[PDB]
Amino acid sequence: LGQIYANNDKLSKRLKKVWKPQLFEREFYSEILDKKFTVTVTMRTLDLIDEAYGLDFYILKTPKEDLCSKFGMDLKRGMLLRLAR
Amino acid sequence: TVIVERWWKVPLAGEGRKPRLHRRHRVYKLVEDTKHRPKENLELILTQSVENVGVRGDLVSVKKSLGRNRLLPQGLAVYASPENKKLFEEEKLLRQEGKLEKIQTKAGEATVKFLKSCRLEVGMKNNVKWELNPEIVARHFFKNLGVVVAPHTLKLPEEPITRWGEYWCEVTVNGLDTVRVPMSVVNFEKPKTKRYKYWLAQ
Amino acid sequence: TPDEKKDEIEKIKAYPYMEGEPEDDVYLKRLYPRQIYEVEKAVHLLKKFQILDFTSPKQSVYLDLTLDMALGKKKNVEPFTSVLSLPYPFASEINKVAVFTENASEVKIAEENGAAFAGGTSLIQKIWDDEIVADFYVAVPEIMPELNRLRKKLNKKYPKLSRNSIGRDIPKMLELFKNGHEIKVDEERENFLQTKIATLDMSSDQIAANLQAVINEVCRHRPLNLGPFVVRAFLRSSTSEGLLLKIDPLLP
Amino acid sequence: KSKSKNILVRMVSEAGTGFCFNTKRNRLREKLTLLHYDPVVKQRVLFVEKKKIRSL
RNA sequence: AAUUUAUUAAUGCAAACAGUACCUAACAAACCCACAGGUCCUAAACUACCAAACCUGCAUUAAAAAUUUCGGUUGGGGCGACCUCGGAGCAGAACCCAACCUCCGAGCAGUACAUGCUAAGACUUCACCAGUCAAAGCGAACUACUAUACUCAAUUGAUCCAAU
RNA sequence: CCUGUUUACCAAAAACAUCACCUCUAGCAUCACCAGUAUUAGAGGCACCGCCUGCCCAGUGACACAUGUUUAACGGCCGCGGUACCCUAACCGUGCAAAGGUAGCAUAAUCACUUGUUCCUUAAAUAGGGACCUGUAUGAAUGGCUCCACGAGGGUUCAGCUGU
RNA sequence: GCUACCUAAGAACAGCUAAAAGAGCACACCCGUCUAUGUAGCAAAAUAGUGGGAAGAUUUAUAGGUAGAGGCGACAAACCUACCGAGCCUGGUGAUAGCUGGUUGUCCAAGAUAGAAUCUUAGUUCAACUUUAAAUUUGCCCACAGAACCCUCUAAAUCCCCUU
RNA sequence: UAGGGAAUAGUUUAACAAAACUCCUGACUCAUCCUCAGGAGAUGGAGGUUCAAUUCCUCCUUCCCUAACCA
Ligand SMILES: [K+]
Ligand SMILES: [K+]
Ligand SMILES: [K+]
Ligand SMILES: [K+]
Ligand SMILES: [K+]
Ligand SMILES: [K+]
Ligand SMILES: [K+]
Ligand SMILES: [K+]
Ligand SMILES: [K+]
Ligand SMILES: [Mg+2]
Ligand SMILES: [Mg+2]
Ligand SMILES: [Mg+2]
Ligand SMILES: [Mg+2]
Ligand SMILES: [Mg+2]
Ligand SMILES: [Mg+2]
Ligand SMILES: [Mg+2]
Ligand SMILES: [Mg+2]
Ligand SMILES: [Mg+2]
Ligand SMILES: [Mg+2]
Ligand SMILES: [Mg+2]
Ligand SMILES: [Mg+2]
Ligand SMILES: [Mg+2]
Ligand SMILES: [Mg+2]
Ligand SMILES: [Mg+2]
Ligand SMILES: [Mg+2]
Ligand SMILES: [Mg+2]
Ligand SMILES: [Mg+2]
Ligand SMILES: [Mg+2]
Ligand SMILES: [Mg+2]
Ligand SMILES: [Mg+2]
Ligand SMILES: [Mg+2]
Ligand SMILES: [Mg+2]
Ligand SMILES: [Mg+2]
Ligand SMILES: [Mg+2]
Ligand SMILES: [Mg+2]
Ligand SMILES: [Mg+2]
Ligand SMILES: [Mg+2]
Ligand SMILES: [Mg+2]
Ligand SMILES: [Mg+2]
Ligand SMILES: [Mg+2]
Ligand SMILES: [Mg+2]
Ligand SMILES: [Mg+2]
Ligand SMILES: [Mg+2]
Ligand SMILES: [Mg+2]
Ligand SMILES: [Mg+2]
Ligand SMILES: [Mg+2]
């Protein structure tokens, strides 16, 4: 949620502007939980999962402030509880 | 992902303090939208054989759509992680523990596969006496089947062909994979003539 | 720059091509880019095809050239016929040409230099009132007023100063033009020019010399270094497929 | 205002000093070559018109 | 009227997503070949088809709107006219002096190419800004040029900013 | 046209609506339209009926796209010179234009001239009615012209009535 | 809870004519044409009489819905709680005002004004005038001499200026 | 402020054999009208170039069309 100058010229009108992410519904498989989840994601999430070599690594490695998802934090607790027990 | 930057400079806040943001700092310019960036490939290690690449343990760079939507979900491929790279590398040592594996390029396999499912139409002229020999046969491979065939790795049905009939020319791709193609020898008709006679009319 | 013409120029540049045989002994043509380049190898190979595909030992080698005969500005250059004999002229003889000269001593010079058809009003009237075919026409300045009658008939093939075919000295084209060979142009103006270069039995070096001569001949229309004038070149025999020669070295 | 009769041009020294001065010339006359004092070399040198600055 | 398209809709491109994939116009004039067809007089190159919508980003055109403004002088305001600069009268003789007072002009042109540099002392449109004149000196020119800050009345436009 | 509607608190009307007529847009269902489906629904103009609604698509708009189509869309629908003596040209010449105001009506609720001219009405009429009318600024669905019924609309009048 | 329009489910409409009715006459009822009275009134829109409609597009009780960048509107720029060219309340807010008004004890002193620019002529900034303090040196009044030709008023005068 | 384009008979235009056209004669008719002819009628201007320039260049005038164009 921000503002822009029309035609990227400061001396022009200042307009409200919202940039929204492109959302995709994809299915992921968790090895630790042995379950498939249909989750709405962004292309950034897919790249981050690729760099982590899987959903489980992504969920476990990513700190709370970067996941920015209550669902993601619940998956982390689920995975961690299975590993702890 | 949309990447933005502020039009207006934000004054330094210092150590251990939060920046003082005026409402002019809400004005942004679009630096770059990363969806329009050139796409990079995804490096995967294959587990099962696939038409595009059919070797278990081959490091393949695929389109992110293909790997994410097909190979990885279905188990055909795995991530090229350090650990997975080691696991498959150990296998390839065991594969070659007896001896080094002979090199057969992926292209060569494809030509072999194409040669398995094709038949050569060796149109020959009625007027002139002809004998189909390796050099002649290699040329026909280029024109009709599109294969650039080494003359030396050529076989034939024992005696080389000399009259119209049915035979087989066995080409060895890279010297390892031998494919025998069905050979149909017909009266020479230029591509122009056949397209007028039949492709145009029929 | 119409989208089709310019986009094709971009596309033709895009087509991949490679030097030398790939590592694979047996490889599908589809699996690798266009290859065969060197003008020496090409001639040697074209002779190979002649034996394999039984055909005349001497054949017309119909060089097709993808000459960037356009994109000087956003306004494109146009096709002309700068005629020059090749270093070793190929065996084609076309000797029907006409010289317009009436009541002048040039009539003698015209025939002395080997004019096929020399005449004045009578010749001009014959062209208008009855059909007659010549490969190229020349006229002295004095006869251009009278010759203007045939302007419409010849559809801009009538002599023009632009082609150096109007002048008191007729031998500019008359003397040399008989042996020289016309570099004709495409009807679709897609830059491909079907122009015989040499007979098949002609030595590779002579055919190579014959090739280079045309390269300069064709650049004559726009021989500027400002805009590249050539993209690709396909040397095809009569009974063979076209081969993509590496013309980039030979361009300048 | 009215149709421009003269133009303003930049006269650049031929001595390579880079010293330039502006002069007025008729639009319909040929490019000017003038002998003008060049401070860098401290003596009169030939100056040749290079560019038109504006229409006067 | 200037400014704008955030908003709504349409369109295009990208993003995203599946796959399957028409190589078309002989003709012998001569010769060959038992046929079927061939030699000569080109048998090239091309290479395309290709995932409908929704959603998101960037553009383009519309729709419907938003923001802000609508100069001054003036024998009330409006209409008409005027708005800066110079010469003359009013203003007779240092300077100065108004009216929608009376008259005539300017928004250049031409010749130079040292209309190069530098520096005492002064003038000044009633402020400021701007504008004006200049000895000496340096460098030139020069011992024929009313030669040294060109003729000409006004012949004109600040700051920011842009181009270089 | 009619019944009806409107400025609660200065305007009830000739303004609005209205039956009728016409143009435009849409081939469709689970919240309006509609539990409907082109004899339908929605957006508008004009205003029952009667007799009519003339010419123009150049410009703007809309639509359609190869030109183009469309005015019951926004709008428009001339001047000159001469020719029967003057009052006027059926008629020709001529420039211009997309077309050049057709029918009807007309001193009108219609710029001014204007209290137009004439007939009727009064003893006397800038009022009223009927005509004449080039209205040079009338005029045909932003409708023209008649005509029943209707009106707390505006104007004129006979007779009666009355302290106006 | 007024009012505009809508939704749900209710109620009222004598008598006479015609018997068909957005028909006529005429109560209840609704509306408000004209006059008078009233005008701090009985009333922040009334009273008396006279009127329009009164089986319909009628009037009316009850509950509910649409909310201000809006609603609703048989368009009067209507109506949306007595004041709607767009409600009311609180807040931003001590909005802003070159505009008007106001600005509180005593006493003394100096003190009246060429102009320029300005979306400026109801205002400002710079000059000018004016005030206080400080510095050190002339200020005012003025003798001869001196300050233009062109041109019709050969003007009253001025400028400069020692002495005093 | 730029750009581009255009200047052919009195009118325009063909970039083409060149015309129409107005005016002005004639002919045809028993005569008049129609009609049919002929007659002269131009390569914006200017300059250069070329033996020769509507046809190669240049500046100006008039007109048309397009558009940027900052303080
Ligand atoms: K007055
Ligand atoms: K009411
Ligand atoms: K009424
Ligand atoms: K139109
Ligand atoms: K009358
Ligand atoms: K009424
Ligand atoms: K009361
Ligand atoms: K006052
Ligand atoms: K003021
Ligand atoms: Mg004023
Ligand atoms: Mg006045
Ligand atoms: Mg005015
Ligand atoms: Mg001063
Ligand atoms: Mg000096
Ligand atoms: Mg009726
Ligand atoms: Mg009222
Ligand atoms: Mg009333
Ligand atoms: Mg009405
Ligand atoms: Mg009607
Ligand atoms: Mg009409
Ligand atoms: Mg007469
Ligand atoms: Mg009429
Ligand atoms: Mg009138
Ligand atoms: Mg009366
Ligand atoms: Mg009218
Ligand atoms: Mg009217
Ligand atoms: Mg209309
Ligand atoms: Mg009445
Ligand atoms: Mg009524
Ligand atoms: Mg109901
Ligand atoms: Mg009743
Ligand atoms: Mg009734
Ligand atoms: Mg009644
Ligand atoms: Mg009334
Ligand atoms: Mg009541
Ligand atoms: Mg109502
Ligand atoms: Mg109204
Ligand atoms: Mg009004
Ligand atoms: Mg209120
Ligand atoms: Mg407030
Ligand atoms: Mg205040
Ligand atoms: Mg005092
Ligand atoms: Mg100003
Ligand atoms: Mg003032
Ligand atoms: Mg004094
Ligand atoms: Mg003194």
Q: Where are the domains of chain D?
A: 5-56
Q: Which residues of C touch B129 (CB under 8 A)?
A: none
Count each helix (H run) and each strand (E run) in chain B, helices first. Answer: 6, 9
Tokens describing residue B107: 């292209």
Q: Which two tokens stand for residue C236?
A: 């095809």
Parallel, antiparallel or unpaired: strands C117-119 and C97-100: parallel
Q: Quick check: C24 and B107 CB within 8 A? A: yes
Q: H-type helices in chain C, by residue range?
A: 3-14, 39-52, 106-112, 121-129, 144-147, 151-154, 174-177, 204-219
State both tokens at B28: 């942004």
Output the CA–CA distances (angstroms, integers) from residue A6 to A15, A21, B28, B32, C164, in the order listed.
7, 22, 11, 17, 60
CA A34 to each of CA A7, A31, A55, B75, D13: distance values in angstroms, whole numbers, following the listed order: 51, 5, 12, 14, 84
Among D37, D21, A69, B146, smallest CA distance to C27 is for B146
| B and D in touch (3+ CB pairs within 8 angstroms) | no
Which candidate, D28, D27, D47, D26, places its Cα nearest to that of D36? D47
DSSP C142: G
Q: What fold, for D5-56?
A: Rubrerythrin, domain 2 (2.20.28)
CA nearest to B58, candidates B81, B85, B90, B93: B85
Residue of B nearest to C36 (CA): B148
Annotated resolution, angstroms: 3.0
The H or E element containing residue A66 is helix A64-67
Interatomic CA distance for residues B60 and B109, integer angstroms: 16
A84 beta carbon < 7 A from strand E? no
| Facing C29 at nearest CB: one of B108, B135, B142 | B142
Strands, DSSP E only, in B80-185? 120-121, 147-148, 166-173, 177-184
B with C: how many residue pairs have Cβ under 8 Å apart?
58
Verify if strand H has an atom below 7 Å from the CB of D3. yes
Distance in angstroms: CA A63, C1' E66: 44
Residue type, position C45, single letter: L
The CATH code of the domain that includes B83 is 3.40.5.10
Question: Do residue C25 and residue B174 have CB atoms under 8 angstroms apart?
Answer: yes
CB C196 within 8 A of CB C89: no
CB of C26 less than 8 A from some CB of B: yes
Buried b (16+ CB within 10 A) or exposed e, B2-22: eebeebeeeeeeeeeeeeeee
Q: Given its phi and psi angles, is residue B41 left (phi above 0), alpha (psi -120 to 50 degrees) or beta?
A: beta
Cβ contact (<8 Å) for A4 and B28?
yes
Domain that includes residue B73, residue range: 42-95
Q: Nearest nucleotide (C1') to the CA of residue B190? A: E43
Q: Is C11 (CB) below 7 Å from strand E?
A: yes
> Best of C18, C26, C45 to disrupt the B interface by mutation (most B CBs within 10 Å)?
C26
